Design an enzyme around this catalytic site. Structure first.
Site, PDB file in Angstrom:
ATOM      1  N   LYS B 149       0.885  -1.145   0.000  1.00  0.00           N
ATOM      2  CA  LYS B 149       0.000   0.000   0.000  1.00  0.00           C
ATOM      3  C   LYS B 149       0.935   1.210   0.000  1.00  0.00           C
ATOM      4  O   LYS B 149       1.975   1.106   0.661  1.00  0.00           O
ATOM      5  CB  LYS B 149      -0.860   0.042   1.247  1.00  0.00           C
ATOM      6  CG  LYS B 149      -1.912  -1.006   1.387  1.00  0.00           C
ATOM      7  CD  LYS B 149      -3.071  -0.558   0.549  1.00  0.00           C
ATOM      8  CE  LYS B 149      -4.215  -1.504   0.820  1.00  0.00           C
ATOM      9  NZ  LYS B 149      -4.629  -1.442   2.212  1.00  0.00           N
ATOM     10  N   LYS B 175       1.126  -8.839  -2.684  1.00  0.00           N
ATOM     11  CA  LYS B 175       0.224  -8.741  -3.781  1.00  0.00           C
ATOM     12  C   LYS B 175       0.361  -7.400  -4.461  1.00  0.00           C
ATOM     13  O   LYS B 175       0.606  -6.369  -3.819  1.00  0.00           O
ATOM     14  CB  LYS B 175      -1.162  -8.962  -3.219  1.00  0.00           C
ATOM     15  CG  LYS B 175      -2.277  -7.952  -3.449  1.00  0.00           C
ATOM     16  CD  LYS B 175      -3.609  -8.712  -3.410  1.00  0.00           C
ATOM     17  CE  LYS B 175      -4.759  -8.145  -4.308  1.00  0.00           C
ATOM     18  NZ  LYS B 175      -5.361  -6.917  -3.816  1.00  0.00           N
ATOM     19  N   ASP B 177      -1.715  -4.807  -6.113  1.00  0.00           N
ATOM     20  CA  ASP B 177      -3.131  -4.540  -6.036  1.00  0.00           C
ATOM     21  C   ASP B 177      -3.748  -4.776  -7.421  1.00  0.00           C
ATOM     22  O   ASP B 177      -3.096  -4.719  -8.459  1.00  0.00           O
ATOM     23  CB  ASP B 177      -3.283  -3.103  -5.548  1.00  0.00           C
ATOM     24  CG  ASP B 177      -4.743  -2.662  -5.416  1.00  0.00           C
ATOM     25  OD1 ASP B 177      -5.409  -3.053  -4.423  1.00  0.00           O
ATOM     26  OD2 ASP B 177      -5.182  -1.935  -6.347  1.00  0.00           O
ATOM     27  N   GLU B 178      -5.043  -4.983  -7.430  1.00  0.00           N
ATOM     28  CA  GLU B 178      -5.772  -5.234  -8.643  1.00  0.00           C
ATOM     29  C   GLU B 178      -5.702  -4.134  -9.663  1.00  0.00           C
ATOM     30  O   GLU B 178      -5.870  -4.394 -10.829  1.00  0.00           O
ATOM     31  CB  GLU B 178      -7.257  -5.582  -8.222  1.00  0.00           C
ATOM     32  CG  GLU B 178      -8.350  -4.690  -7.551  1.00  0.00           C
ATOM     33  CD  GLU B 178      -8.085  -3.975  -6.229  1.00  0.00           C
ATOM     34  OE1 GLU B 178      -7.622  -4.546  -5.216  1.00  0.00           O
ATOM     35  OE2 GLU B 178      -8.366  -2.784  -6.235  1.00  0.00           O
ATOM     36  N   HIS B 268      -7.977 -12.444  -8.342  1.00  0.00           N
ATOM     37  CA  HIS B 268      -8.675 -11.389  -7.653  1.00  0.00           C
ATOM     38  C   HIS B 268     -10.051 -11.159  -8.283  1.00  0.00           C
ATOM     39  O   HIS B 268     -10.242 -11.012  -9.485  1.00  0.00           O
ATOM     40  CB  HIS B 268      -7.865 -10.168  -7.769  1.00  0.00           C
ATOM     41  CG  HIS B 268      -8.370  -9.068  -6.882  1.00  0.00           C
ATOM     42  ND1 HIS B 268      -9.592  -8.571  -6.780  1.00  0.00           N
ATOM     43  CD2 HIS B 268      -7.556  -8.390  -6.010  1.00  0.00           C
ATOM     44  CE1 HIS B 268      -9.549  -7.604  -5.878  1.00  0.00           C
ATOM     45  NE2 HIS B 268      -8.322  -7.509  -5.427  1.00  0.00           N
ATOM     46  N   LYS B 308     -18.422  -9.436   8.791  1.00  0.00           N
ATOM     47  CA  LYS B 308     -19.720  -9.766   8.233  1.00  0.00           C
ATOM     48  C   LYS B 308     -20.130 -11.096   8.887  1.00  0.00           C
ATOM     49  O   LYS B 308     -19.741 -12.178   8.430  1.00  0.00           O
ATOM     50  CB  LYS B 308     -19.482  -9.803   6.694  1.00  0.00           C
ATOM     51  CG  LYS B 308     -18.727  -8.566   6.112  1.00  0.00           C
ATOM     52  CD  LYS B 308     -19.099  -8.239   4.648  1.00  0.00           C
ATOM     53  CE  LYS B 308     -18.329  -7.046   4.079  1.00  0.00           C
ATOM     54  NZ  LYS B 308     -16.949  -7.400   3.793  1.00  0.00           N
TER      55      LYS B 308
END
Lengths: 123, 441, 441, 144, 441, 123
Positions: B149, B175, B177-178, B268, B308
């Site tokens: 990030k 990763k 990022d997408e 992803h 969630k």
């Protein structure tokens, strides 16, 4: 605020960023293995205990994943204490070696365990 | 109402869909389900074939009691309708024309029973869970990942250093990022070269195989394969594709390129909530991942859970199984509307992502267990002592969660506590438990 | 609320989106719009760049009065975020993470202002309206198409004959349905060989260029190009791709294959109502076609109109212009939330489809005008006297609609009547006016 | 006789063969059919998989009355044994080692039930009867 | 009876076959042999050539006294009938139409005299015995092999570990079973990668060249070469092909790929007993291996001997010579019905296999001698102390058999005893002599 | 049930998993060689006595197969004891070297023998 060592924090995957397991913690692990149905086995490396790639550098090719098996899988072992006798015999023979306890899950046809059982002096 | 067939006995070479149809007021449910099936055919030349062999049968309609008055119409599609080994075709033939029928307020695809005779026309994961662990030589825990990030923002040498600090700290995977493909600030081939450098260093530092999910996604089939080809040139273990913006045609081509070349594929699912969030219209993520287990990917993002919660955690647990397991039989409380026999198609490893940092560790470890990837962005990067301290910090947290589970403790209740014990013996982890507890207890 | 920027002055190298956000009760609209923008970044390493250059600015929030209490938040995305010439990237960076934010009930993307500096990174239509008419030598009317029916059902020699009867009767184009790829009953390469045969015959019969939209869609990038390559081998003029099931990565590859080889591309939008039907969540079809004018296609299905009527006919008319025109300035009644300067990217020809047969002809002819494709399935195939009589029948109906418009009659009121006049001098069309009037007047 | 399985219920993803086995005198028919099936596996490492998933089951043995005393042993082979779309593999895995077993005088493979899940891994005829007649435009007779 | 030619003098450019014909009762033997030859031609256009140049001559008929009343008819085929360098052609032209003639109960091909002018049109072994030992640097014993077991069953990392334990124990070679190609449990390219790893390790452990017979057999020519190509990428020394299920066309292509790339070829003869077991019908294995010495392979399985005993051991010894030797002259007791001059085609190394474990060692060592591969499955894998102990155990057993032969002992009588001596000084071998003697003495 | 050593069981092919041959067993071997018609020769390696691949990793390419010849082949030697004098002289010069006795079969144009005659200290 600290720095984590670039030298000498060589790791042996699962369970190696923990304190070293006491024979009690090692035994409970070997007893877990066993309470899921998985055959324990010991691998021992005398010669460089870290992956490397010498032979070929292709995608997902690494030298050093395979160690020598210490004897066989303890098929139908029910007592984890039988097992610790082996870590301890191997260790006589190879004060050299890094020993690791692996396990086989024949239901899934796959190896499911690998924890370092004995780091050689100063590892 | 020649497409509503109460008497149809399903074939084992049938794609069955379970559509939650919400008809327009006045459409009889029967006529609603038959309408969904009828988007299969219409007549004249029709007397030069038997349309009776190429039609969707709405064999059963159930009432979705109390979620409103909606119905789960069960359509049954013949095998002959689909092009063998084409998720682009199975989605065109099912989700292609039905969702826009005037006589439907909002229709939603909940599940698919992909017959084994169709399953067999697919390569699947270029590797899947098992070979992946054999390749990587990692056994006994969920694997760890770090998301660099900011996504768009830094240069290539910077992305590349973030990567290494993180991976030397004991995470296994980092990763792109997408959104990171090749962009003015950071062009692909240099991100690839520096992330390659960074991971071999981190791996020669730890002694553990490390790898970076290099985003091979691009705007043409050709450029995607071009980037993939250069990962292969580095000997790096994994590449990445967002399969919903890039495409199913393309995804399948990256996935056969990686099988044949030995690269793992982290898929992803960007864009999925555009199709799968609403309850009454769209296609439900479990369908969108059956489509990926077939098109091919080795990891697939399944989202986070501890955020969630329970009840809906049951449908997460319903599609993790659909992903990971050889046979997921019928269980309409976890949202499996049909049994699924995957006939030895490799499983895809769930990547749990978002909201996560350490008191999540035992829960995550419990929801998911061993076969998952716990991917931290801020859980690692947002550590006080930076990147490698954050890596060590999620890692010893996980291994505490492994040891506790292994010596029969119940992560579900002792969890928070287990992590309490761990803070204590780790400096690195303790400073993570602090900022943890800047919102914890 | 560092992403809500009331004071931002837009750059001309900004992708602006207009998101209809429906916040969770209690999210301030400001905080809702800033949330949509904030799915652009988060911090630490952030001090090694200036995140201030790579963030979405929710510069304005408007209140969607009376459609509920929803808001049109206007985000502004920097050019540097996108990979030049990649619709897969522009969709990952915008519709990739925002639509699944807890603090959003349902969010919908209404429009995009694709800046000209970004427009220029795209090939666009391999041809577009003009070259297409030059190539095809057709001027003065909307072109006509016949959709073979049943889609899945007949053999290849049968598909192929339907094709010819239809095309000799004066339609210009015939379509492989979106579900037809290669399938057990009809494998691709034979459909290609017989539809090739059928169209050269029909064209040597009429003297007019005829062509078949051969569906090049497949499950791998490689097979899609393989089919495309064989159309090229036949010298046939157009191929077809469903761009939402196949993908944007792929689409762009078929579209650069066709530019370089001189084939036209009929794009079918199957699956679109999964994303674009609901008013409160998804991406609105005008965005889904700006993405196609950029990824590339020569025809794009825009649906039918005379069925779905006036007021909403205004947003149809809003995106047909967005498709066909060089500059579509700001018009928030036709749903253009932003001016769009297409800086000489070729236009895509609207294909109107579904529900159509002849009293539609003047209306269609009027909604759309000259630059469209009127595509009939049943309007042609479901004629009494079969395929060629149905072709002649939609055709003389259209040419009656052209002559009437041309000698200043008002298709909007005289329409039904104009067709009344035409029935009379045509046998073929008259029997079409009968079954017309089995539901008409 | 762990390969002779009277109780096996076939799967629809099974290659079934129907072998006419003519055993060596003294092989019990049961032991003959189980022998044909057993040319699928043998043990040790075997405890690192479940060989129970990769074995041929001689589920039924019938007596070929009067053509001599021969038997139609029915073996059932799991789908996982075969490489998708490879007749070279299906023949190596079935006709590859069994026909030369000492305890068999002469064995013959009579039929195969190629399951549809396996059928689907094959291209098949590049054309086949129908397209062939369409291509060739010949209808109504055998061709010459 | 214009094909029965008692007076024909053979040419040295003739393929001679020796068919054991068992006529239908009533066919005169003469008419039987002439019938076998006549499957070469029939008439009309025949006057536009001289069929006298393209016919098989049954020049001699012998009576197979006492094996029943069968006859060895000797047919002589002209060189001009065969496509130079094609075993697919020599088998079509000989075994192609004759074995199904009504006037024949059962016919069997016993031998072929492949003339030197035809021999010369063949590449042969990509290497053969000598270069093979030079390459491998192994001299003085039969080489040792381990067959991994179970064939179908384990994963790739498992196959791969079996491989290494075995090879570090001093065997030289390990084998993918004939049934192992790419299959749901173990897909090829990972078996290749792990068996590569395993053999370089075992070789860096011993200091002796190790290698794995990677099964390159597949369902298309293309995939077979694809797998072969990846062995080459690893630098591994040997690949494998079953030549009867894959084919002679294909075999010849793997064999020219390996010559040109320096890989050795272990040929497995799966399916051969379908053709060669019955005494009265088929083609006799010596013909099936003359076909492989010409098509090409470096090792060929010749079965085991100590099981199937003396008298029949003479025909084993007849075709081992036909395989290994430059000239195997006429010897109708070892089943050589014709002299064979191989005109410097490389020899193929016999692989003895099945039933074997150590009291076989001296006998095997004696039947075969130095130029053979002793391949153990259970002789190694089924050792008490596992894989490497089993490897050491067959190995020191062999080397005891070498030393004993070398210091003139007679393995044929001292054998069992020689092994007795060896048990004593080896722990590893002694535990193998025990389970040996669980059925021995 | 035993383990076979991962360290230090480096092998020198034929006859090396046997006990070391006494000069009697070596002599009988050299006398066999000779009773088949094969010319004996000695190879000696000073520098790493194990194959490796440094120069190129192609299929069937290995470095280290070739040693230096110790003098020539003992063409027409009839007395094996002549030969053992050479193993023994070489060994004076090279207490370093691993010596091996190889043999040439000129009938088949090929080398047929290779047994390790002297393992250097601690091999």
């Amino acid at each position: 605020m600290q720095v984590w060592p670039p030298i000498n924090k060589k790791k042996y995957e699962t369970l190696s960023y923990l304190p070293d397991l006491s024979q009690e913690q090692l035994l409970s692990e070997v007893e877990y293995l066993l309470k899921n149905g998985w055959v324990p086995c010991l691998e021992f490396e005398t010669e460089h205990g870290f992956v490397y790639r010498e032979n070929n550098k292709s995608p997902g090719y690494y030298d050093g994943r395979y160690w020598t098996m210490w004897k066989l899988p303890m098929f139908g072992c029910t007592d984890a204490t039988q097992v610790l006798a082996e870590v301890e015999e191997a260790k006589k023979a190879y004060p050299q070696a890094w020993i690791r306890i692996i396990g086989f899950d024949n239901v899934r046809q796959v190896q499911c365990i690998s924890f370092i059982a004995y780091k050689p002096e100063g590892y | 109402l020649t497409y509503y067939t109460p008497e149809y006995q399903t074939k084992d070479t049938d794609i069955l869909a379970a559509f939650r149809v919400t008809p327009q007021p006045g459409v009889p449910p029967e006529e609603a389900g038959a309408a969904v099936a009828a988007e299969s055919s219409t007549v004249w030349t029709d007397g030069l074939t038997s349309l009776d062999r190429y039609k969707g049968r709405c064999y059963r309609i159930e009432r979705v009691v109390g979620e409103k008055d909606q119905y789960i119409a069960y359509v049954a599609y013949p095998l002959d309708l689909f092009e063998e080994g084409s998720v682009t075709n199975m989605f065109t033939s099912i989700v292609g024309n039905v969702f826009g029928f005037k006589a439907l307020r909002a229709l939603r695809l909940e599940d698919l029973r992909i017959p084994p005779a169709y399953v067999k026309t697919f390569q699947g994961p270029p590797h899947g869970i098992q070979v992946e662990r054999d390749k990587l030589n990692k056994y006994g825990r969920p694997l760890l990942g770090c998301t660099i990030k900011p996504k768009l923002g830094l240069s290539a040498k910077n992305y590349g250093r973030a990567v290494y600090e993180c991976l030397r700290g004991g995470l296994d995977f980092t990763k792109d990022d997408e959104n990171v493909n090749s962009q003015p600030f950071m062009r692909w081939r240099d991100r690839f070269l520096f992330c390659a450098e960074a991971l071999y260093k981190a791996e020669a530092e730890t002694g553990e195989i490390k790898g970076h999910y290099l985003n091979a996604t691009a705007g043409t089939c050709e450029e995607m394969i071009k980037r993939a080809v250069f990962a292969r040139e580095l000997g790096v273990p994994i590449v990445m594709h967002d399969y919903l913006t890039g495409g199913f045609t393309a995804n399948t081509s990256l996935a056969h390129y990686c099988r044949d070349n030995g690269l793992l594929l982290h898929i992803h699912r960007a864009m999925h909530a555009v199709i799968d969030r609403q309850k009454n219209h769209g296609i439900h993520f479990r369908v969108l991942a059956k489509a990926l287990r077939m098109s091919g990917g080795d990891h697939i993002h399944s989202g986070t859970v501890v955020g969630k919660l329970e009840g809906e955690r049951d449908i997460t647990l319903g599609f993790v199984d659909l992903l990971r397991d050889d046979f997921v039989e019928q269980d309409r409380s976890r949202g499996i509307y049909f049994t699924q026999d995957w006939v030895s198609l490799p499983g895809v490893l769930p990547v749990a992502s978002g909201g996560i940092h350490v008191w999540h560790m035992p829960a995550l470890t419990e929801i998911f267990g061993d076969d998952s990837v716990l991917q931290f962005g801020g859980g690692t990067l947002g550590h006080p002592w930076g990147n490698a301290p954050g890596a060590v910090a999620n890692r010893v947290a996980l291994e505490a969660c492994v040891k506790a589970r292994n010596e029969g403790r119940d992560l579900a209740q002792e969890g928070n506590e287990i992590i309490r014990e761990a803070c204590k013996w780790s400096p690195e982890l303790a400073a993570a438990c602090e900022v943890w507890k800047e919102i914890v207890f």
